[PDB]
Amino acid sequence: GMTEYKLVVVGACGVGKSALTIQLIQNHFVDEYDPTIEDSYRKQVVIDGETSLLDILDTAGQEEYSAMRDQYMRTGEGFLLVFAINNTKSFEDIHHYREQIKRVKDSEDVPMVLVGNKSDLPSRTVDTKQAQDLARSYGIPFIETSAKTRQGVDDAFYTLVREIRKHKE
Ligand SMILES: *CCC(=O)N1CC(NC(=O)COc2ccc(Br)cc2NC(=O)c2cc(C)no2)C1
C-alpha cells in the first residue's frame, strides 16, 4: 500500500502556517485566516517517483503548556519550523519550538525543515546566512518560501517527506 506521514506545521503567530498549508492543499492564498483554527488536511502527493499520503496538522492555540497538545504532537513524524523573514522574534522562537519537539519526542532526531516564509517581501530582517547557519547547526534543510506567490511551498513540504523517508528506513 501507500505510506502515510503525519506532518506538523509549527511557528510563531502570524508567520504563515495556515497560508502555507492552504496553498499546498487548495492552491490559493488566504489573507485573513482565523488564527484559532487548528485542523488536519489530507493530500496524496508524488515525491521522487513515490506516492505518499500526507496528513498535515496546522497548529495554532496559545503559548502554554498542554499535555493534550503534547499527545497530539507526539504522533507527528515530521515538523515544519516556520518563521517570517521580516520578524526577528519568530526566528528567535524557532529554537524554542525545536526544543519542545525534542521534549515531546524523547529527544529523537526528529525530521524537521526550517522554513523562512514571506520571502516575497522586501522588508527582510532575518538574513539568509543566519537562517542557513542555524539549519546547519541543527542538521536540517532550510527552504525559503512565499505562501503569497507560492514560491517554495511544494519544496518545503516535499523536503520534509524526504527527511522522514531518510529517517525511517
Ligand atoms: C496566531 C496563533 C498561532 O498561530 N500561534 C500561537 C502559537 N501557539 C503555540 O506555540 C502552541 O504551543 C506549541 C505548539 C507547538 C509546539 Br512543537 C510547542 C508548543 N509549545 C509548548 O509545547 C510549550 C510547553 C511549555 C512549558 N510552554 O510551551 C502559534
Ligand SMILES: Nc1nc2c(ncn2[C@@H]2O[C@H](COP(=O)(O)OP(=O)(O)O)[C@@H](O)[C@H]2O)c(=O)[nH]1
Ligand atoms: N507577503 C506575504 N504575506 C504572508 C505570507 N504568508 C502569510 N502571509 C500573511 O501573514 C498573515 C498571517 O498568515 P497566517 O497564515 O494566518 O499565519 P499563521 O498565524 O502562522 O497561520 C496573513 O495576513 C497572511 O496574509 C507570505 O508568504 N507572504
Ligand SMILES: [Ca+2]
Ligand atoms: Ca493559522
Ligand SMILES: [Ca+2]
Ligand atoms: Ca489554555
